[PDB]
């Protein structure tokens, strides 16, 4: 049985490899396990940080934004997340044409 932390380690390495597809899959699995109440050294915000950017890297801005908003519900002061929100929004606005 792969734990939330196991999923996270796998996703983190995928991330560095820039394998965003597998980052999203592993990070998603981590999150679900967390959402279901798994007792883990890893936290939701950290999963969300990777997950949101991985989804972005694959071109789903809409979903990247939602995950970002989700992270910020949890950690409103999150620096990267706050930046990401404005960035994603900027690109989306410039996208609409």
């Amino acid at each position: 049985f792969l734990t939330a932390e196991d999923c996270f380690e796998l996703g983190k390495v995928a991330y560095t490899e820039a394998d965003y597809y597998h980052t999203e899959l592993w990070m998603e699995q981590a999150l679900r396990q967390l959402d279901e109440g798994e007792i883990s050294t890893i936290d939701k915000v950290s999963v969300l940080d990777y997950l949101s950017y991985a989804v972005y890297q694959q071109g789903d801005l809409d979903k990247a934004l939602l995950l970002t908003k989700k992270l910020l519900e949890l950690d409103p002061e999150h620096q990267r997340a706050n930046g990401n929100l404005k960035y994603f929004e900027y690109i989306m606005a410039k996208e609409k044409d």
Partner: peptide
Amino acid sequence: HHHHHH
């Protein structure tokens, strides 16, 4: 963060 825009 690794491949971040910043």
